[PDB]
Design a protein around this nucleic acid. Structure first.
Ligand SMILES: Nc1nc2c(ncn2[C@H]2C[C@H](O)[C@@H](COP(=O)(O)NP(=O)(O)OP(=O)(O)O)O2)c(=O)[nH]1
Ligand SMILES: [Mn+2]
Ligand SMILES: [Mn+2]
Length: 425
DNA sequence: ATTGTGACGCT
């Protein structure tokens, strides 16, 4: 009853850019705007692998992880932009820099947690309190929410339905109670409209967002009405929303754990989890996961928005599939040097921009015929931003994997160099 | 022959 805390203390948003790499390329090349297009990596093998797809191209069935040649079968007029290649590998610098543009705008409104190259969580609780006190009890006009959907409304064309649901929501609002969670979410949504307007004005990029009381619901909400819209998921919307929500749609349950929840419990949807005790869930999935699942199926999650705008690691990876797998010593050395040169460039720029230095270098490899994505992972000291030294140390750290009696065997199908353990400088 | 990352948990 009164003592069952409902996890309505916070206002959290998740902002995620729409078809991000495509928008970056469309901004640079106006011929690509408002067209079916996609961004690929490489080009020789089946036209390259697609990593981002405009919404126009998605209507033809083009998806991420498709080969461009196959996508062209679905979409013969598909336009393609290629990721930059430097030193024989994909170079994602243009998109990392675009990301920083967006992150810097978001950071003006509130402390953010970078969650990927194109998305961040925002803790808006303090900003909402400030705005509520500034409103001095003034109601909230629908004009302030021009791109907001209220999940689960209306009850009882697309734009018309959106505005009907928004009117139902706004007429139901108790504007006098500065502590109403629903009001707090609404004011959050007003701020997020302003944030998304600023992002689009100042970068040209459109994005969607979710507003709810925690990160998992905010991330789920964001995807409900993409592209170029934001979605408010209130605490009261959760039972209906979860009643037909496949468990795999929830962040962290899209893999083996979610499959085991489904198989062991004999359920399909998030809402069915409510019928199990906390102890039952802890028994099957462990104490942490069990407590998390017990609260999350009731809409409650406590994971904080971490104050972290910069990546915690800076890494460089390249696959060598099939007959391109590295089978000589000179090959492994040359590719370790290419990787180290890109790493050195990114680290030197990171030091100048962010006043920090990495102190540990992680070397990861895959060997041909190995089932695992990473065969060996070994760390050494990173004492100097020098590509030649980083590559020699990575080699020193992996060389005892070679079983040849000049050659390399088994051949290497992946190299990975990652700088970690940053320290102020 | 999805590839290139990046966060985080387990032991
Ligand atoms: N290298 C690489 N980059 C990737 C991969 N997957 C995604 N990216 C890059 C390209 C993506 O643009 C970007 C952001 O990933 P999302 O937010 O998951 N997708 P988006 O913003 O495209 O569309 P939506 O409107 O549905 O959010 O990350 C990958 O497997 N490899
Ligand atoms: Mn995105
Ligand atoms: Mn994203």
């Amino acid at each position: 009853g009164p003592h069952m805390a409902t996890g309505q203390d916070r206002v959290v948003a998740l902002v995620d850019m729409d078809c991000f790499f495509v928008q970056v390329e469309q901004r640079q090349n106006p011929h690509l705007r408002n067209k079916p297009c996609a961004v690929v990596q490489y080009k020789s093998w089946k036209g390259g692998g697609i990593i981002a797809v405009s919404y126009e191209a998605r209507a033809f069935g083009v998806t991420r992880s498709m080969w461009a040649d196959d996508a062209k079968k679905l979409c013969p007029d598909l336009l393609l932009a290629q990721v930059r290649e430097s030193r024989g590998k994909a170079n994602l610098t243009k998109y990392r820099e675009a990301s920083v543009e967006v992150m810097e705008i978001m950071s003006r409104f509130a402390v953010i947690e970078r969650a990927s190259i194109d998305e961040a969580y925002v803790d808006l609780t303090s900003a909402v309190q400030e705005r509520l006190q500034k409103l001095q009890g003034q109601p909230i006009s629908a004009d302030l929410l021009p791109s907001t959907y209220i999940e689960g409304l209306p009850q009882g064309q697309k734009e018309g339905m959106r505005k009907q649901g928004l009117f139902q929501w706004l007429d139901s609002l108790q504007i006098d109670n500065l502590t109403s969670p629903d009001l707090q979410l609404t004011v959050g949504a007003v701020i997020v409209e302003e944030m998304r307007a600023a992002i689009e004005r100042e970068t040209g990029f459109q994005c969607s967002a979710g507003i709810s009381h925690n990160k998992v619901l905010a991330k789920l909400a964001c995807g409900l009405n993409k592209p170029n819209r934001q979605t408010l998921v209130s605490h009261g919307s959760v039972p209906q929303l979860f009643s037909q929500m496949p468990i795999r749609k929830i962040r962290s349950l899209g893999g083996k754990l979610g499959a085991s929840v489904i198989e062991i419990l004999g359920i399909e949807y998030m809402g069915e989890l409510t019928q199990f005790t906390e102890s039952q869930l802890q028994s099957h999935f462990g104490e942490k996961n069990g407590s998390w699942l017990y609260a999350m199926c009731r809409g409650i999650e406590h994971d904080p928005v971490k104050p972290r705008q910069l990546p915690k690691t800076i890494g460089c990876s390249k696959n060598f599939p099939g007959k391109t797998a590295l089978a000589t010593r000179e090959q492994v050395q040359w590719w370790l040097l290419q990787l180290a040169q890109e790493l050195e460039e990114r680290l030197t720029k990171d030091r100048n921009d962010n006043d920090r230095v990495a102190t540990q270098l992680v070397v990861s490899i895959r060997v041909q015929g190995d089932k695992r994505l990473s065969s060996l992972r070994r760390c050494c000291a990173l004492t100097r931003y020098d590509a030649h030294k980083m590559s020699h140390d990575a080699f020193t750290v992996i060389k005892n994997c070679n079983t040849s009696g000049t050659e390399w065997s088994p051949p290497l199908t992946m190299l990975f160099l990652c700088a970690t353990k940053f320290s102020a400088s």
